[PDB]
Design a protein around this ligand. Structure first.
Ligand SMILES: NC(=O)c1ccc[n+]([C@@H]2O[C@H](COP(=O)([O-])OP(=O)(O)OC[C@H]3O[C@@H](n4cnc5c(N)ncnc54)[C@H](O)[C@@H]3O)[C@@H](O)[C@H]2O)c1
Ligand SMILES: NC(=O)c1ccc[n+]([C@@H]2O[C@H](COP(=O)([O-])OP(=O)(O)OC[C@H]3O[C@@H](n4cnc5c(N)ncnc54)[C@H](O)[C@@H]3O)[C@@H](O)[C@H]2O)c1
Ligand SMILES: O=C/C=C/C=C(\O)C(=O)O
Ligand SMILES: O=C/C=C/C=C(\O)C(=O)O
Ligand code: NA
Ligand code: NA
Ligand code: NA
Ligand code: NA
Lengths: 484, 483, 483, 483
């Protein structure tokens, strides 16, 4: 069918070997993707290094920002093509792609272009022993070549979340999208080319991780930084890989996030909110709630309500009427998720709903669908309650006391996000500050202001991105001290 | 003299002890107790528990007041700290009195003040339902901070990490260099006497591999590791903490250049390069071991620096008009001399020094070397590309501005650079093109503690100082309220 | 018993003096020397000259250190300051010990700390020739700051202006209220003893119109006039400095509302509104003279507040259990009692108070009034729209959230508002809709000195506090270097 | 043509009208309708109401998008705006195409962008009960912004105020100079076509006293008055708004100095001072009317500048290589020529110029004057101390750096200064000592829109630009939540 090429030094190029891109809706082949080899990865990095010395390196911040807005214009001009690409790779509902995924990719470019135009640095005056003084001023310069490695959860959103600030800060880029979701990134390369982005500034390499393009990229001494979103264990691997070169790193690594529903929550809103936080993108978001804590006084009503709403969810085709959930990303990921579904039963869970695979009795049975699933009855120490599944699942447990639930939320090796439901003013601020995570939402979930710091604690990450945090990470911060 | 660990509010010995040796005369100063894995665990657990005790309940203002009390404690025992630092390292008493100890005090006071005045951000946004949302950020303590520090500027560097760590409400497990354990031990006494709650500040003594340093980096209970020292050690530590994805902050030395343009105040530049090459006997990460001087003033510059270099007094720390003490250790002298010989083998001209002075007293059992200047090596020579960390510099002529910028940047390191020029445009044009974290113009190692400090390439990861320290030593959390 | 001016490093008398009267008993406390136009000129010229003296050459660190010594000086004479504030105003000794004097000290320390830690901005831009330019900003002293303060919280308000003025390196000519001259005079002594150079801080006593206050505002040698007091006086001062285009900053009182929603913690709201209505006998610009209570809890709220108001002990500043002292002066009492009468004529129900207590002792020669609560007036009544500045509130029921927001905002003033609610969305939704400079939720007059402070409409111009004071009391200069 | 008011979404005429006259040739360009007091009231009331309409409901993002569409609209009619600016003022077409119109576009885009990216502050504090509090600040629209602008840079200065006003969500009543009403009227058309809701932007035409300008300043319905123009007028306006305590922001011109040090690039400095003295025929608030040149290069500088001034082409706005058009009006020429005479009477040597060119065509009916250079005047001469606002400069020698700093600062004005020097230290040392809001080194009027812009002394009150505009055109509110 279609073919997805690498984009290296201003040219789309094939490779000696290719791999299949499979549609998870029906198991069908979508495209062949050309896997970049070590030589092609080197060529990309070298091209990126050289482009720093070319026209790109000479652009004013204003001209750079203008070109980045042109990249965003180019995505907007091919909006439905990008929607189609993202949907084909992942099975996500078309409505989700049209409202979350593709708009956020456009917004990523525009916001960081704007931040680049408006951001400034610092001036520090000091006295000296001779009485004449000195001036210290800081500047932001490009860090150099940014290696970007992104996952399949929100392919274009996460890819552009890294590529946008990288380019806004005047860096050049070598970027490796997930082998599961290569299409929109390839379309993005086309937009870059058509927008007139100079050769070598943006390079797209396809492939896998170990023994493939991903590993080749992290090991290349020519990069200045590696920014990554994906599995915690992969973060550790990458951190070791770049250590000999002391490369700058930025990791967002998923979690085992909790939602907490206090007795004073708006109960219908909380049920809807937890439905969203547990089952959005079929549970395949690092920010999803796989643990839910509900006050004992409302526990039964909450569980019954969520069961009903989960069973109301339409699981099916991306453009099907009223669809809420598509499949998992791949048969391989479904294997992991189903193994946890089995483990929960073995650990003594009550399966409130789901727990298996829907039977469609059509081509979708060859796809990688699972049921939205709710568990109760597990202890806080069960594997299914402590390890990240990354499926459309949550376990629900009662609690009695505010300090109790705070400690239970924090009793985790992860620390990415938490969502709290309460109508009480003091409770909202008092509890949120005590949760050991990078991101707290109160009475909502995954509401994003791109200027805010975003990241996690513990195994969930290293560093922050977003707003000034990205402007700092993707820049060399240099202090220049002038003796007067 | 005995130096004990300080764990959970108590001074404790260990099963193993090692020698602390004065580098001036090779004499024994103290027995130092080496923390084992069990004690390192005891320290981290104590620090974890201290976050949940009285320390964790202090307001930012009360926390800052207590930190100013630590600073008062150092000031009150000022000469004791001076003598501890001098005994360990052989540094001139005058340097200890003007740089090392006052900076330690200033580190605590500055970060205490930054903590009092610092604030975070508020972002407003609109939502679909027309009600809006607000996102605000807060800085919280990161948790337990692991601190591993080197011997170059013992108390200064130790407190450069410990002060912001405490100011941000963290607890600390700190391991000073086995070569300079004394002032950190006296700090533990000041902390105790100021009434810092047990577990908040813990001091562990020992080495790196198979010792307290390694055990600290491997401990799952810490939240960050901040480190200053050798680049290869940074790499090792970065691998060590990777499985726990710990926050890291590294300053890793370098091979720094000074550049003297033809329009420099020549006398000021000679004096400045003498300072940047030979301060603390050249044992500062920021020292200029490479110097580039415009061809038109090269001979005059080299001659002038030779004269000044040979006027330097190498002797006892309290000796009249002393300029230089010994190197930190005989082991370090072995490294440095090995480089002295390598320079000759590489075809260098030895403008001055190149050996060790002869004292005919106890100092001959110490670890002294001479201030040394080389010329005549190529840019690819090992002696011009590898960090020596001794009182040495190589001087090379250059002709063009773009040329020297490229030669300065042609390095796997990238910590600092000092530029000498009287020209306005040149200062700003050139400074911005040097690939380092820190540039000084017409000075060297002039420090405003609010500024970002750190390196690029093999010279580091991250920035500390001012708000960069307030961010690194804090959990930054975003709280989003849907209205 | 005699209060002198402090001009160019010397305490000086004047040709005329006026009486300082104790409002507890109407007795004479001291005679105060009134600065004439000639002495006001002498003060401004000395302040101009001090800018060129040792004060001008101090580093920001040395300046901050000295300001901390001023604070130390107040702390060393803490009880004398308490006695001074209490004598002039009749405020309870407990209030003076807990609010007034500690805030004056905190004012100096906080702005000293901000001076030490604050920095400015660097902007890079590209140019036609490809070489670029740098713009950087600096904060410099504005010059001579004229400070005019009121009698409400005499030392607190005086130092609220003097502390940032001095922290930013200005020199100062300051005129405290004729009603409360004592603590400002003691402050002059602290400055003197602290070694603040002559001319840096000058104290001038007197009245407003046709006296020291007027003369100061009309002097061409000042660089700014900061003022807290009556709104119409703000307008007068704004016209007075206009020909010189002087920088101005005004906080001008108001007619503040407290709002108690049906979901409020009722007991907390009652105690809260007791504080916000009767603190300092209702003589604070931030006091709530209008109160809106949801009709479901209206009767219960008014009953509870009546009981608590009637439990207030009104009396001597050192009286066991005293809660309220007198009004500042007989003349101010005349105004307040005029409003007490007007309220009755306007149809008010007097829930409690409404007159003067009968003590049958020397307090009857003082300026006491009763804490007072009204109900039953229209939103357009004079007693509900005009600032009384006494220990009084009118309470009105309301039904709807949008209704009460509009009623709060229906005012020519806009200083502060206190809102009582336990609902998360309501707190943030309502607070952002109130047209004032300052909103408190579930509290009142809780002050973080870093925050912007000021009013809208007739309640002010500009903001002070934190960075806003650092900006106002500074020349902000932009320096652009073409490279 | 005919230029109408734009009020509540409609173009409207008036009872009275006045002439718009081309200063190149004295010909009538348009009739302009003068808004009366009734119409000013209608505009302010329309602005107040528009705050409660769809404008007030827009998200910051949607508001910024709309402002970007305003900018798009000006760009889409770029040459129409150019022709309008040129017709009114006689400015060179090249200047209008490179400075005036592009800056108007950039004004809207920059403040739209700043609105999108700017945020506010979060401060945490501890309280007695140990539960804590949080203070967060928000930026809200101030309300109705009155804008009064002058004829020096008509659309640039008009949009410099209107853009941040709209970006901060205010509504606007704006009064452009009677001398240059065209581009503002075109801007009203752009707003209308972009779909800016009725009442959000209102344009009123007329004069000052007893006309639209005065009526606007006296209207109690405005929330602020921002103004650029003559110092005396700023003073008058400051008095006019005083009774309402309206927020004010003033930039008020000056008597700016250029300084040329002996180490300057002399050719660059000659070119630089040519630009700073004669750009827009010297009709910019920032122009250098005083020049100080080191004695050692004084003669060479003056001869060089004389030659370059005499090569300036004075003539038609679209003439081949024109450098200078006429002055704004015959009335302004009367003022400027009166100063030309006065300089001679004060004993000046007329190095070049001093009269009016003879064209022998329609330009003789215009308002042209010659670029003029004087020498030989005292620092106290009227022509050296009073703003002329024509294409003139006086040049005086100096000997010492501290001397020249004092001479530059010896002025009742303090807007800007340009300094020429190749020395690094001198650039930073001297710039910091000049008592003005704006310093340029080795350039002049190089603008980064994010930087603070304003003057000291009689040259202004407040700063605008970047965050300073975001603060001025907003209500800053502090919301304190007790937890
Ligand atoms: N950046 C600097 O300021 C700095 C300071 C001193 C030395 N150095 C460089 O390194 C050389 C010094 O030798 P060194 O052994 O003292 O440097 P080092 O970097 O190995 O030692 C620094 C600190 O880290 C500890 N450490 C060493 N190995 C460790 C490990 N595997 N895990 C945890 N901690 C470990 C040490 O005990 C010591 O406290 C010098 O020649 C110089 O080039 C740099
Ligand atoms: N905002 C506040 O904190 C505050 C404080 C005190 C009083 N007030 C209000 O004002 C009334 C008090 O009367 P007041 O006379 O004491 O207030 P005032 O505003 O007239 O006096 C305040 C200060 O300004 C000075 N002053 C007065 N007129 C002046 C003038 N024309 N030029 C220069 N300085 C002048 C005074 O001497 C005093 O130091 C109260 O009833 C109350 O409503 C407000
Ligand atoms: O040996 C390296 C020196 C580091 C200096 C600092 O960290 C400092 O001065 O803050
Ligand atoms: O005539 C006065 C100059 C005004 C310039 C500006 O306000 C600007 O360039 O922003
Ligand atoms: Na796929
Ligand atoms: Na030692
Ligand atoms: Na009195
Ligand atoms: Na005209």
């Amino acid at each position: 069918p279609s073919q997805l090429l690498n984009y290296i030094d201003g040219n789309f190029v094939t490779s000696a070997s290719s791999f299949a891109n499979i549609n998870p809706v029906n198991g069908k082949l979508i495209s062949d993707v050309f896997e970049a080899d070590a030589k092609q990865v080197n060529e990309a990095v070298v091209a990126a290094q050289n482009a720093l010395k070319g026209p790109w390196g000479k652009l004013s911040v204003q001209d750079r920002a203008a070109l980045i807005h042109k990249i965003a214009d180019g995505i907007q001009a091919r909006f439905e093509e990008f929607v189609a690409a993202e949907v084909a790779d992942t099975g996500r509902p078309v409505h989700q792609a049209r409202t979350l995924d593709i708009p956020r990719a456009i917004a990523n470019f525009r916001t960081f272009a704007d931040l680049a135009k408006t951001s400034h640095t610092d001036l520090f005056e000091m006295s000296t022993s001779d009485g004449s003084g000195a001036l210290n001023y800081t500047v932001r310069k490009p860090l150099g070549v940014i290696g970007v490695i992104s996952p399949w959860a929100l392919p274009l959103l996460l890819f552009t979340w890294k590529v946008a600030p990288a380019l806004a800060c005047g860096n050049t880029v070598v970027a490796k999208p997930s082998e599961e979701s290569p299409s929109s990134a390839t379309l993005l390369a086309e937009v870059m080319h058509d927008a007139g982005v100079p050769p070598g500034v943006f390079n797209l390499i396809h492939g896998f991780g170990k023994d493939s393009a991903g590993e080749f990229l992290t090991q290349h001494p020519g990069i200045s930084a590696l920014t990554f979103t994906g599995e915690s264990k992969t973060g550790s691997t990458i951190m070791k890989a770049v250590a000999d070169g002391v490369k700058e790193v930025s990791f967002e690594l998923g979690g085992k996030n909790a939602a907490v529903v206090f007795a004073d929550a708006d109960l219908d809103a909380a049920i809807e909110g937890v439905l969203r936080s547990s089952f959005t993108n079929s549970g395949q978001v690092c920010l999803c709630s796989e643990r839910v804590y509900v006050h004992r006084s409302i526990f039964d009503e909450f569980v019954s309500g969520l069961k009903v709403e989960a069973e109301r969810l339409v699981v099916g085709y991306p453009d099907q009427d009223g669809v809420n959930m598509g499949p998992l990303i791949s048969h391989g990921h479904r294997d992991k998720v189903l193994s946890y579904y089995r483990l929960a039963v073995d650990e003594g869970a009550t399966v409130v709903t789901g727990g298996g695979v829907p039977k469609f009795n059509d081509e979708r049975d060859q796809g990688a669908y699972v049921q939205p699933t709710i568990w109760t009855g597990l202890s806080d120490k069960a594997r299914c309650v402590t390890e990240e599944i990354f499926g459309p699942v949550c376990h629900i447990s009662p609690f009695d006391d505010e300090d109790e639930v705070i400690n239970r939320v924090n009793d985790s090796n992860y620390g990415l996000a938490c969502a709290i439901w309460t109508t009480n003013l003091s409770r909202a601020h008092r509890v949120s500050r005590q949760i050991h995570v990078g991101l707290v939402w109160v009475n909502t979930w995954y509401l994003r202001d791109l200027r805010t710091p975003f990241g996690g604690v513990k195994l969930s990450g290293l560093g922050r991105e977003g707003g000034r945090f990205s402007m700092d990470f993707y820049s060399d911060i240099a202090n220049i001290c002038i003796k007067i």
